[PDB]
């Protein structure tokens, strides 16, 4: 809370972290039946590209101003 990094950062000072997004994860969804998927009696979680596919499908399938919640 003491340093003034706007002109330059002190040489001893270490940056706390680099800012990155966590691993994208989403509940798995099947497209031919339009349901969430149950695995061993529980919801199955996928990650990264498949989760992005699920999100993209849901985003394309909805209308813009139709729903009050969005």
């Amino acid at each position: 809370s003491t340093i003034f990094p706007f002109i330059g950062v002190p040489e001893d000072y270490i940056l706390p972290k680099t800012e990155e997004l966590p691993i994208f994860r989403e509940v798995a969804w099947d497209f031919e039946k339009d349901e969430p998927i149950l695995e061993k009696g529980d919801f199955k979680i996928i990650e990264k590209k498949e989760a992005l596919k699920v999100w993209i499908y849901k985003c394309i399938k909805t209308n813009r101003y139709e729903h009050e919640i969005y």
Binding site: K49, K53, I56, I60
Partner: protein, 59 residues
């Protein structure tokens, strides 16, 4: 699109009237007198409005 003289119809009409078609040539078949009757043909293709969308998404 195309519009043309109907050759087969003229040939059939001339055959029915009884004219000998073997001796005459194709130009003479096209330009033969038919007696108040005209035969034509045409080709068109009719457009339709868009009502479905098929998206192929890559990754």
């Amino acid at each position: 699109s195309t519009v043309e003289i109907d050759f087969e119809a003229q040939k059939s009409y001339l055959k029915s009237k009884g004219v000998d078609l073997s001796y005459m040539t194709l130009q003479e078949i096209k330009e033969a007198n038919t007696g108040s009757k005209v035969f034509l043909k045409a080709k068109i293709k009719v457009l339709d409005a868009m009502e479905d969308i098929d998206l192929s998404i890559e990754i």
